[PDB]
């Protein structure tokens, strides 16, 4: 139902958050702030 | 702590998924749940 | 109506692709790859 749409949207936002946290790790390892 | 502005929040916390779907018709909600197959 | 929300969800798979490509590029630069 609409609950599957809510879950997949909130899951894609969590995957996006994990990828932003991995980009933030790798930027910091390159000697950034 | 400044980190609370993002720790536990994605790049897209600008609308709640309850309110995002709120105005759709019953045949739109069916055809939007069908899109989840194409998205995966 | 809902077609704008279809495209909004398909877009997150593409942002996550841009992010994975940048994760791969930075893992190359910092020697983790």
Residue C33 DSSP class: -
> How many other CB atoms are found less than 10 A from the CB of residue C9?
17
8 Å CB contact between C7 and B35: no
Cβ–Cβ contact C29 with A under 8 A: yes
Residues A5, B34 contacting (CB under 8 angstroms): no
Report, in angstroms and rounded to the nearest whole number, the Rg of chain C calculated over CA atoms. Answer: 14
Residue of A nearest to B34 (CA): A5
Q: Name the experiment that determined this structure.
A: NMR
What is the Cα–Cα distance from C18 to C15, expressed in whole angstroms?
5
Delimit the domains of chain C by residue range.
1-26
Please name which of A33, A18, B29, B39 lies closest in space to residue C19, comparing C-alpha atoms: A18
Instruction: Supply the angle between the helices A2-29 and C3-29 in degrees, to the nearest 10.
Output: 20
Q: How far apart are CA B28 and CA B17, in angstroms?
A: 16
How many helices (H) and strands (E) chain A has is answered by 1, 0
DSSP label at residue C20: H
Say which of A4, A8, A16 has its CB closest to residue B10. A16
C3, B25 in Cβ contact below 8 A?
no
Q: Is B1 exposed, middle or buried (CB count within 10 Å of its CB: 0-12, 13-18, 19+)?
A: exposed
The region that residue B25 occupies, defined by phi over 0 for left and psi between -120 and 50 for alpha, beta otherwise, is beta
Per-residue HEC secondary structure of chain B comes to CHHHHCCCCCCCCCCCHHHHCCCCCHHHHHHHHHHHHHHC
């Amino acid at each position: 139902g609409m609950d599957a749409i809510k879950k997949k949207m909130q899951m894609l936002k969590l995957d996006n958050y994990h990828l932003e946290n991995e980009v933030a790790r790798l930027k910091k390892l390159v000697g950034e702030r | 702590s400044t980190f609370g502005y993002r720790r536990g929040l994605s790049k897209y916390e600008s609308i709640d998924e309850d309110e995002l779907l709120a105005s759709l018709s019953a045949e739109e909600l069916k055809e939007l749940e069908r899109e989840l197959e194409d998205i995966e």
